[PDB]
């Protein structure tokens, strides 16, 4: 599913991301925009052979099992395919573990390069949340 901006902001808020670990909702929506263009089915292969999955491009090296990333872990204890669902629950729950891991939203390189230090409230402006 390809979400609209406000639609995703609302779903993220319902699923508990608003100010989670201090990150306002606009940070999460901005990250999703540049990671996946709001498309739950987005996948992208990494140079190391791992793959990124779903609206927040969660990586198989650490976070989910895809059966083809040698030597990886599955810290969210889910198949990576669960991260492609129209239901964003698995992605949000796994994202909460990632953002708690020590480096905050810097785990998402696109957030660091394109969202960090910007007016992220713009991403939720006009939304009935
Ligand atoms: Cl990407
Ligand atoms: Cl694997
Ligand atoms: Na393997
Ligand atoms: Na932080």
UniProtKB/Swiss-Prot annotation:
First-level EC class = hydrolase
Which Pfam families does the UniProt entry name for this protein?
Lys
Reaction(s) this enzyme catalyzes, per UniProt: Hydrolysis of (1->4)-beta-linkages between N-acetylmuramic acid and N-acetyl-D-glucosamine residues in a peptidoglycan and between N-acetyl-D-glucosamine residues in chitodextrins
Instruction: Report the domain of life of the source organism.
Output: Eukaryota
Question: Which Gene3D superfamilies does this entry report, sorted A to Z?
Answer: 1.10.530.10
A GO biological process this protein is involved in?
A: cell wall macromolecule catabolic process
Q: Which UniProt keywords apply?
A: Allergen, Antimicrobial, Bacteriolytic enzyme, Disulfide bond, Glycosidase, Hydrolase, Secreted, Signal
EC number(s) per entry: 3.2.1.17
On whether Hydrolase is a keyword of this UniProt record, the answer is: yes
Quote the record's binding site residues for substrate.
101
Q: Give this protein's Gene Ontology molecular function annotations.
A: beta-N-acetylglucosaminidase activity; identical protein binding; lysozyme activity
Q: List the disulfide bonds.
A: 6-127, 30-115, 64-80, 76-94
Compartmental location: Secreted
Q: Which residues form the active site?
A: 35, 52
| InterPro entries assigned | Glyco_hydro_22 (IPR001916), Glyco_hydro_22_CS (IPR019799), Glyco_hydro_22_lys (IPR000974), Lysozyme-like_dom_sf (IPR023346)
The main place the protein resides is secreted
Give a brief account of the tissues where this protein occurs: In the egg white and polymorphonuclear leukocytes.
Under the cellular component aspect of Gene Ontology, which terms does the record hold?
cytoplasm; endoplasmic reticulum; extracellular space
Sequence similarity = Belongs to the glycosyl hydrolase 22 family.
Functional description taken from the UniProt entry: Lysozymes have primarily a bacteriolytic function; those in tissues and body fluids are associated with the monocyte-macrophage system and enhance the activity of immunoagents. Has bacteriolytic activity against M.luteus.
Q: What else is known?
A: Lysozyme C is capable of both hydrolysis and transglycosylation; it also shows a slight esterase activity. It acts rapidly on both peptide-substituted and unsubstituted peptidoglycan, and slowly on chitin oligosaccharides.
* Protein known as: Lysozyme C
Q: Which gene encodes it?
A: LYZ
